[PDB]
Nucleic acid binder design. Structure first.
Length: 704
RNA sequence: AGACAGCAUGCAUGCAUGCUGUCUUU
RNA sequence: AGACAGCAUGCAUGCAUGCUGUCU
């Protein structure tokens, strides 16, 4: 059952172990810490890692002092402490830091990309109704620390999708308003949403000088160079403000596109290179890693050519039973379970509003048939669906659909569920990004209305019964009549609590923020949810927000001395952790608190189709965990789970997580997140965008 | 002395070729 | 492989100048 991850043990043991250490003349503002380290490595030319407040250069310096200039014009002075000897890294950060810099100095990554081009240049550029599209290979490296304490190189491969089109071009060619595009600057390893666009006619001369003077890359230097010399360009050229507070000229900014927001035709050519199956991927990873070894071993770097291995499989309680007690263990679906299944009917008249979007007027028959058989099925379950209104919307593009959905959805009030049939809408404007299914989902989630959006492509492709159940199972859950429950979960847990918090910014000060909290009993059924907006608190926000969660648990009569598990989609920072102990005492609860980091984790490469439950154990109580099986084409990315604190083993916390997976009530699609935090961040970001104070709650998975 | 052609050197345009560098893909 | 810059060349047409030969 062997499963391998793209992680490779790494250590650094050079012959010359002599570094030159540098210290700040006064404490450095923490988020300025990385910019400074980067800067040391440019001047020095010597790889550098940061050791608490000090800087370590892998060579011999003489320079008594060393002055570095940040983009502000701000100057940090480093003094030479003197040479120190190197024995080990204290943590992975040091190790990563130095490791990448070596990659830079040696230029391996650069070579591989070049090489990769010489050979696939042609297979990597593709054609489309109107546009051309480059798929550019991205090699990426982090350093992690395993359970036994070895460091591990995390190595991956991806294909960033891009047009052949400068951002300037698109802003003269159009006069367009795209404050919602992601972007990469040529020769800069950065990618981030376009914040603010102004023109270059509004800035002096000394300006583009300093701008040049402080550029930390060749291409940005050469960019501002242009505007510094050629005044012809100035009046024409545009200037773009970036996500994490950068400005670049518009000629070095090219868009970064996502698979999804590809117009249909394109998606298809793309698909093979972008979605490449495990084997190939792993082989390239292997292939790069070799170059890396070959090019770095001579400077003292020791890298196993061998992949770490899945430590094993966790069993978790996947047994599930209906209102009669009929039960079966969840692996994939049991389409059979769902047929003979008999739900916990809480509300037995349901009022649907129906919407259908479509090109022409009399072709509703597939939809009408599908609806007929749902209504039926649901009746044979104790539920009668009753239809309050239908709306047939004719439309010819996504936009026309959109414009027309807006008032229709607007008038909708007092209903258990809305069902929406969406016709297929072929392309759009490629800048005018927009998934139509989502839009609907979004507009209805804002209304707290549980909804079912059925793609008319799905009814043309999939079998009526297959579809029937997937829908039938969500709708049942959606609307309070839970179709089956978990028998139990590992541990003697009393509530599982999922927290989620989004915060709008202004001058580094947190202004609006929206918290979504979801509470579940021991057997794992929703007890109530909590949708709360907060006005501005600063420092004090984090405390209030948690505080509420506790004052809440208590109003639900969680008898003190009860046990409370807290999953979170984000990444808990220090103040939260302590904030949690505080309230853990005051309310007298024993708490397990987890951090779930879903994005960009190492991958399992394995022969087994059913990798749910696999894992690899990292240092400090954190685990890489498969939560779903490899359904092919799309990427299986495991979740990283991390016991911040608690009396229970992480393996036990992980199985709970796997149990709760099943409570998203989606036997067929493979929901990656567990039911406490699933879609939590979608809702949180979504209500933020909102335009007035919110404080709602309820007892029904309206969001599924 | 004029008018025309072969060759040489120096220059003018046109078109084409070999190598090297950059960036495209720090 | 393409875009641009460095360098080295080739063919072609003419002009400059120079010796060459024809010419009414």
């Amino acid at each position: 059952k062997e499963a391998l991850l793209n992680l490779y043990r790494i250590e650094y043991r050079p012959k010359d172990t002599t570094f030159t250490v540098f210290k700040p003349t006064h404490e450095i503002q923490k988020e300025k810490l990385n910019k400074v380290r980067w800067r040391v490595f440019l001047q020095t030319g010597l790889p550098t890692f940061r050791r608490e407040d000090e800087f370590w250069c892998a060579g011999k310096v003489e320079k008594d002092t060393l002055y570095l200039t940040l983009s502000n014009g701000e100057i940090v002075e480093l003094k030479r402490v003197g040479e120190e000897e190197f024995r080990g890294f204290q943590n992975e950060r040091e190790c990563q830091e130095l490791f990448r810099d070596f990659l830079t100095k040696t230029k391996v990554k650069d070579k591989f990309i070049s090489d990769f081009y010489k050979k696939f240049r042609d297979k990597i550029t593709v054609q489309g109704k109107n546009r051309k599209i480059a798929l550019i290979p991205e090699v990426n490296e982090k350093v992690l620390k395993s359970e036994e304490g070895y460091f591990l190189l995390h190595l991956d491969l991806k294909f960033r999708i891009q047009p052949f089109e400068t951002l300037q071009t698109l802003l003269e060619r159009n006069d367009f308003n795209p404050k919602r595009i992601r972007v990469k600057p040529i020769g800069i390893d950065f990618v981030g949403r376009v914040q603010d666009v102004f023109k270059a006619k509004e800035k002096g001369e000394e300006f583009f000088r300093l701008c040049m003077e402080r550029s930390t890359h060749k291409s940005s230097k050469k960019a501002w160079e242009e505007l510094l010399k050629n005044r012809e360009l100035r009046e024409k050229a545009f200037l773009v403000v970036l996500e994490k507070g950068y400005t670049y000229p518009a000629t070095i900014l090219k868009p970064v596109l996502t698979y999804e927001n590809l117009e249909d035709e394109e998606r298809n050519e793309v698909a093979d290179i972008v979605r490449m199956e495990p084997g190939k991927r792993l082989n390239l990873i292997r292939y790069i890693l070799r170059r890396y070894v070959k090019a770095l071993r001579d400077y003292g770097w020791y890298i196993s050519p061998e992949e770490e291995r899945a430590k094993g499989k966790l069993n978790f309680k996947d047994t599930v039973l209906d209102a009669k007690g009929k039960n079966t263990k969840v692996i994939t679906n049991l389409r059979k379970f769902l047929e003979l299944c008999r739900p916990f009917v809480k509300k037995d008249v349901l009022s649907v509003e129906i919407i259908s979007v479509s090109v022409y007027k009399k072709l509703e028959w597939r939809k009408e048939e599908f609806l007929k058989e749902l209504i039926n099925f649901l009746k044979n379950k104790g539920i009668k669906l009753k239809i309050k209104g239908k709306s047939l919307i004719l439309a010819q593009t996504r936009e026309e659909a959109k414009e027309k959905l807006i008032p229709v959805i607007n008038k909708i009030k007092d209903v258990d569920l809305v069902i929406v049939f969406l016709e297929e809408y072929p392309k759009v404007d490629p800048y005018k990004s927009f998934l139509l299914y989502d839009f609907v989902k979004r507009e209805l989630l804002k209304k707290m209305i549980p909804s079912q959006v059925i793609l008319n492509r799905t009814l043309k492709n999939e079998n009526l019964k297959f579809v029937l159940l997937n829908v039938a199972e969500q709708v049942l859950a959606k609307t309070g009549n839970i179709p089956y429950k978990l028998k139990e979960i590992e541990g003697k847990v009393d509530a599982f609590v999922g927290i989620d918090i989004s915060r709008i910014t202004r001058d580094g000060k947190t202004v609006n923020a929206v918290a979504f909290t979801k509470i579940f009993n021991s057997k794992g059924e929703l007890v109530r949810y909590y949708l709360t907006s907060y006005p501005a608190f600063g420092e004090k926000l984090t405390e209030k927000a948690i505080g509420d969660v506790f004052s809440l648990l208590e109003k639900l009569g969680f008898k003190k001395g009860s046990k409370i598990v807290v999953h979170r989609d984000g990444r808990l920072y220090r103040d939260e952790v302590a904030a949690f102990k505080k309230y853990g005492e005051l309310y007298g609860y024993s708490l397990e608190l987890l951090e779930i980091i879903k994005r960009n984790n190492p991958r399992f490469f394995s022969n087994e189709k059913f990798i749910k439950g696999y894992f690899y154990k990292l240092s400090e109580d954190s685990v890489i965990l498969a939560t779903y099986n490899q359904v092919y084409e799309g990427t299986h990315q495991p979740i990283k789970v991390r016991k911040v604190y608690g009396e229970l083993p992480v393996e036990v916390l992980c199985s709970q997580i796997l149990s709760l997976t099943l409570m998203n009530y989606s036997s067929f699609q493979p929901i990656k997140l567990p039911a406490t935090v699933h879609y939590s961040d979608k809702i949180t970001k979504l209500m933020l965008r909102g335009i007035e104070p919110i404080k709602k709650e309820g007892d029904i998975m309206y969001w599924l």
